[PDB]
Amino acid sequence: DAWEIPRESLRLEVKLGQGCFGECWMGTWNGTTRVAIKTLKPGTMSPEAFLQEAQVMKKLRHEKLVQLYAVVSEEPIYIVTEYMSKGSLLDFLKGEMGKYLRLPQLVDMAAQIASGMAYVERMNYVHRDLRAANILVGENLVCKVADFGPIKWTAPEAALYGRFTIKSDVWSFGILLTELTTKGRVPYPGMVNREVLDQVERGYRMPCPPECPESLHDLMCQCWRKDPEERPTFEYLQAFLEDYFTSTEPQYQPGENL
Ligand SMILES: *[C@@H](c1c(-c2ccc(Cl)cc2)c2c(N)ncnc2n1CCOC)[C@H](C#N)C(=O)NC(C)C
Numbered sequence: 001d002a003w004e005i006p007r008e009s010l011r012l013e014v015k016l017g018q019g020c021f022g023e024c025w026m027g028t029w030n031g032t033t034r035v036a037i038k039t040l041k042p043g044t045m046s047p048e049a050f051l052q053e054a055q056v057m058k059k060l061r062h063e064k065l066v067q068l069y070a071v072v073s074e075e076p077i078y079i080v081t082e083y084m085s086k087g088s089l090l091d092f093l094k095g096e097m098g099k100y101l102r103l104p105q106l107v108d109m110a111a112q113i114a115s116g117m118a119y120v121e122r123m124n125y126v127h128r129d130l131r132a133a134n135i136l137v138g139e140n141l142v143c144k145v146a147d148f149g150p151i152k153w154t155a156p157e158a159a160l161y162g163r164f165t166i167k168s169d170v171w172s173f174g175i176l177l178t179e180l181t182t183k184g185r186v187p188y189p190g191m192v193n194r195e196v197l198d199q200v201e202r203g204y205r206m207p208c209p210p211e212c213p214e215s216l217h218d219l220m221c222q223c224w225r226k227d228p229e230e231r232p233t234f235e236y237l238q239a240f241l242e243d244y245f246t247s248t249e250p251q252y253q254p255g256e257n258l
Contacts, residue, residue, distance in 0.1 A: 001071075001073070003058060003068070003070060003071045004070070004071055004072070004073060005029075005070040005071070005072060005080070007072060007078075009029055009030050009031075010027055010028070010029060010035075010037060010072075010078060010080070011027050011028045011031075012025040012026075012027045012037055013025065013026055013027055013028070014026040016036075016087075017038075020041070020044045020045070021040070021041065021044070021045050021050070022038065022039040022040040022041045022045065022050070022076075023038070023039045023041075024036065024037065024038040024039065025037045025038075025039070026083055027080075029069065029070065029080060034083045035069060035080050035081065035082065035083055036080070036081050036082065036083040036084065037078055037079070037080050037081075038078070038079045038081070039076060039077070039078055040075070040076050040077040040078075041076075042075050042076060047075060047077070050077055051073065051077065052148075052149055053079075053147075053148035053149040054068070054071055054079050054148075056125070056148045057079075057081075057148055059123075060119075060120075060123065060125070062115075062116055062119040063115075063116075064112050064113065064115045064116030064119070064142075064143070064144050064145060065116050065119070065120075065144055065145045066081050066082060066084065066136055066144045066145065066146050067081055067082045068080070068081055069081055069082065082138075084136035084137060084138045084142075084144060084146075085137075085138055085139050086137040086138060086139070086141075087136070087137060088132070088133055088134075088135070088136060088137070088146075089109070089132045089133070089135035089136065089137050089143060089179075089184075090131075090132040090133040090135075090179070090184050091184075092137050092184075093132065093179065093180065093183050093184030094183065094184045098183055098184065099183065101183075102254055102255075102257075102258055103181075103212075103213070103216075103252065103254075103258045104245065104252075105141055106180045106181065106258070107180075107216075107241055107244050107245070108141070108241075109137075109141060109143045109180060110176070110177060110180055110241050111238060111241035111242045111244075112142065112143045112144075113135055113143050113144075113145060113173070113176070114173070114234055114237045114238040114241050115234075115238050116144060116145045117130065117145065117166075117169060117173065117234040117237075117238075118233070118234035118235045118237070118238045120145070120166070120169070120234070121166050121233060121234045121235065122235075126164050126165060126166055126168070126169060127145070127147075127148075127169050127172075128158075128164050128168075128169070129147050129149075129150065129153075129172075130145070130153070130169050130172040130173055130176060131150075131153045131172055131175065131176055131179070132176055132179040132180070132184060134146045134147035135176075151193045151196055151197060152175065152186070152187045152188050152193065152196055153172045153175045153176075153187070154168065154171070154172065155167070155168040155171035155172070155228070156197065156200055156201055156226075157228060158171075159197065160197075163228075165228060166234070167228035167229065167231050168228070169234075170223050170231040170232060170233075170234065170237070171223055171224055171231065173223055173234070173237065174219075174220045174221075174222075174223025174224050175187050175220075177216065177219070177220045177223070178206055178209060178220065181209045181212045181216070181258060182209050183257075187206065188206065203226075205220075205221055205224050206220070210257070210258075211255045211256065211257055211258040212258060213249050213252070215248050215249055216244075216249075219232075219237070219240065223237075
């Protein structure tokens with residue numbers, strides 16, 4: 001295992017995250033290079049359980065998935081990755097940084113996540129938890145996919161029958177598109193989880209968010225088709241979002257919030 005590294009090489013400066021699973025920090029690796037590090041509390045999560053997501057980050061490599069750098073596979077376990085300067089995509093949209101984002105940047109972000117997911121698609125994996133809080137933003141508004149181990153984001157066939165496919169990811173990607181256009185507000189405003197399952201199942205889909213182009217709401221609606229197989233591919237979505245402003249919405253004018 002060439003991914004393995006020694007311990008004195010990690011300085012853990014700033015503390016970013018925590019919970020049941022363990023902490024995650026900003027650090028340094030061999031004195032110079034800036035990294036992000038994620039830790040394990042041995043009590044709650046088991047040793048072979050926490051490893052799970054790191055075996056998965058070894059077998060994947062793409063400019064839009066957060067990159068593995070090194071691992072310390074002896075307790076307490078450490079996982080080392082590139083440092084995404086600008087935090088979770090959800091915080092970014094909610095906070096004072098995201099009030100000035102308009103459609104052109106928001107669509108470019110969507111296209112980058114779509115790229116990363118089209119790579120997941122090609123490699124026959126399934127994400128399961130694709131949403132704005134597990135997208136990390138970097139310098140120059142680079143967005144990358146982050147979690148490798150919630151009914152408002154999960155497709156119904158998945159939430160009800162455990163059927164998690166790349167098509168169930170496409171559903172979630174559609175909800176992610178509403179997070180990008182409402183500055184990271186919670187999808188299904190006012191509805192609690194049990195009420196969302198009922199409504200969705202009976203055909204309800206979110207309306208076109210204010211100032212969102214109808215062509216982009218149509219796309220969300222393709223991603224939310226009752227039938228998994230009539231939802232588009234990430235290859236299709238990528239290509240669509242990449243060319244948005246020539247091929248679909250060349251008329252685009254900026255507005256007050258998009
Ligand atoms: C904390 C975290 C990470 C991160 C993600 C994945 C891995 Cl394997 C290691 C660390 C971040 C990175 N890479 N860059 C910048 N910020 C990062 N954070 C976000 C800080 O959240 C406040 C990680 C995430 N996301 C986390 O908190 N996860 C546990 C399971 C709660």
